[PDB]
C-alpha cells in the first residue's frame, strides 16, 4: 500500500496563506517516479481535483478554481509533497487529500481540514447530558460539546475503553457562527451504580482538553 500522511494546514483568514505537506511511503519504485495530486472536498459536496505534479517537479497542472493562488511542489530527496495556498478565500474551505492516482499505486491520505474565515479559534464548553429519564433496561448519557471553532474536536469515553454503543454526532454550525455537537453512549441501566463515565473532549485548534464525568439525575 502507498501510505500518504498530510500535514498543515488549519484555520486561515481570507487573503492569508497556508501550506500543506504530505509524506509518502510505500511506493514500489522510488518516490521520484510518481506523478502526485491534491484533491479537495468541501463541506456538503463531492470531490474536486485541485492540482497535479510530475515526477521531477515540472510540469504542473491546476484547476481553474485555484490557478494563480496555489502552488504545488515536491521534494524528492524527502518523499514530500506540498501545496502552498496563497490568497485564501471562503470557497477554499475543504478537506484536502494528498492523492496518488498512478494506476497500480492508488492511495489517498486521510485528509486535512482547511478553514478560510475571519472568526477566530475557540475552545468548546463541555456540559454533560445527564442519565435520568434518558432511559428501559437501558440508559443513555452523553456530552454536549458546545461553541467551538474551527472543526474538529474529538470525543473519546473513558479514554477509548468504552466504544460499545457510542454515537458521536456530526458537528452543526450554529447561527452564532460557532459549532456544536453531542456525543452519546447507551450503557446498561443498573451499571450507573457504581460505574464512572468520563468523556474526553479535545480541540487541537485551541490546544484544549477537557475530561468530564457525567452523572445521574
Amino acid at each position: 500500500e502507498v501510505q500518504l500522511v498530510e500535514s498543515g494546514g488549519g484555520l486561515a483568514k481570507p487573503g492569508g496563506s497556508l501550506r500543506l505537506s504530505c509524506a509518502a511511503s510505500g511506493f514500489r519504485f522510488t518516490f521520484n517516479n510518481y506523478y502526485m495530486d491534491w484533491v479537495r472536498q468541501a463541506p456538503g459536496q463531492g470531490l474536486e481535483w485541485v492540482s497535479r505534479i510530475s515526477s521531477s517537479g515540472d510540469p504542473t497542472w491546476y484547476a481553474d478554481s485555484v490557478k494563480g493562488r496555489f502552488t504545488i511542489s515536491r521534494e524528492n530527496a524527502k518523499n514530500t509533497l506540498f501545496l502552498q495556498m496563497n490568497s485564501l478565500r471562503a470557497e477554499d474551505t475543504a478537506v484536502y487529500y494528498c492523492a496518488s492516482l498512478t494506476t497500480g499505486s492508488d492511495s489517498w491520505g486521510q485528509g486535512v481540514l482547511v478553514t478560510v474565515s475571519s472568526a477566530s479559534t475557540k475552545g468548546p464548553s463541555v456540559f454533560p447530558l445527564a442519565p435520568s429519564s434518558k432511559s428501559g433496561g437501558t440508559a443513555a448519557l452523553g456530552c454536549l460539546v458546545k461553541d467551538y471553532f474551527p472543526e474538529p474536536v474529538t470525543v473519546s469515553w473513558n479514554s477509548g475503553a468504552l466504544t460499545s454503543g457510542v454515537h458521536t454526532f456530526p458537528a452543526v454550525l450554529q447561527s452564532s457562527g460557532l459549532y456544536s455537537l453531542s456525543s452519546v453512549v447507551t450503557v446498561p441501566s443498573s451499571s450507573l451504580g457504581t460505574q464512572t463515565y468520563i468523556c474526553n473532549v479535545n480541540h487541537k485548534p485551541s490546544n484544549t482538553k477537557v475530561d468530564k464525568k457525567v452523572e445521574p439525575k
Partner: protein, 213 residues
C-alpha cells in the same frame, strides 16, 4: 474537460440486492476510468481501476464494466457496510473530473426510534444558556419529524438537528435535536417536550420533562 455523468445521484437497496451505478463520459476515454468508495468521514478508497480491474482486497461483490464513453460499476450483493457515496473518475487527461457521486443507502425493515430527552445541566445554566437535547436512537427509515414544544407551544427556528451515518452492521440511524435558549427564557416555562413522528410509530411519541424536578 471531460465531463462525467454519474447515475443515479442516489439510491436505496436491500441487503443482498444487485446495485448498478453508471458513469458516462463526454469523450472517448477508452478504458481509463476508476471507481471509488467513500465511506462517511473517510477518504475515498479505490474499488476498480482501468474500468474492470479489481483492487486487491476489495470484495468480489464489486465489478467494473464497459469502455469508450459508457462505464458501469456493479455491486453483486449489497452488504450493510456498503453505505457510501460512490464516485467515478476519469484518468485520461487533465483536468481531472469526477462524477457527482451516488449515494447508496441500505434498506431494511422499519424500526421505530427510541426517544430520550436530556435537560440542561447546572453548569450550563450557571452560565446563562440552556440547551435541551432530544435523542432518537436506532431507527429506519431516516425520515423523522422532530418538533419541540415548550409549554405546548411549538418551537420554530431556535433548534437544530444532526444525523449519524447508517450504522454499518444493523443499517439504522440515530438523530439529535437540540433546542437552545437563554436562562432568561428557559426560566419562564415549565414543560419541555420533543415530539417525534416516524413511520415505525403508530402515533407521535412525546417525551417531556417539567423544569427542575
Amino acid at each position: 474537460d471531460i465531463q462525467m455523468t454519474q447515475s443515479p445521484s442516489s439510491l436505496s437497496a436491500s441487503v443482498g440486492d444487485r446495485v448498478t451505478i453508471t458513469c458516462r463520459a463526454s469523450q472517448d476515454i477508452r478504458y481509463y476510468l476508476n471507481w471509488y468508495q467513500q465511506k462517511p468521514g473517510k477518504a475515498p478508497k479505490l474499488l476498480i481501476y482501468v474500468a474492470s480491474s479489481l483492487q486487491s482486497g476489495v470484495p468480489s461483490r464489486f465489478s467494473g464494466s464497459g469502455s469508450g464513453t459508457e462505464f458501469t460499476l456493479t455491486v453483486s450483493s449489497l452488504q450493510p457496510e456498503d453505505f457510501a457515496t460512490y464516485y467515478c473518475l476519469q484518468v485520461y487527461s487533465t483536468p481531472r473530473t469526477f462524477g457527482q457521486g451516488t449515494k447508496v443507502e441500505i434498506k431494511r425493515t422499519v424500526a421505530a426510534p427510541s426517544v430520550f430527552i436530556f435537560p440542561p445541566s447546572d453548569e450550563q445554566l450557571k452560565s446563562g444558556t440552556a440547551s435541551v437535547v432530544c435523542l432518537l436512537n436506532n431507527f429506519y427509515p431516516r425520515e423523522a419529524k422532530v418538533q419541540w414544544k415548550v409549554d405546548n407551544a411549538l418551537q420554530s427556528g431556535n433548534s437544530q438537528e444532526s444525523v449519524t451515518e447508517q450504522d454499518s452492521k444493523d443499517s439504522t440511524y440515530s438523530l439529535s435535536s437540540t433546542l437552545t435558549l437563554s436562562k432568561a427564557d428557559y426560566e419562564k416555562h415549565k414543560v419541555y417536550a420533543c415530539e417525534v413522528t416516524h413511520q415505525g410509530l403508530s402515533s407521535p411519541v412525546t417525551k417531556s420533562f417539567n423544569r427542575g424536578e
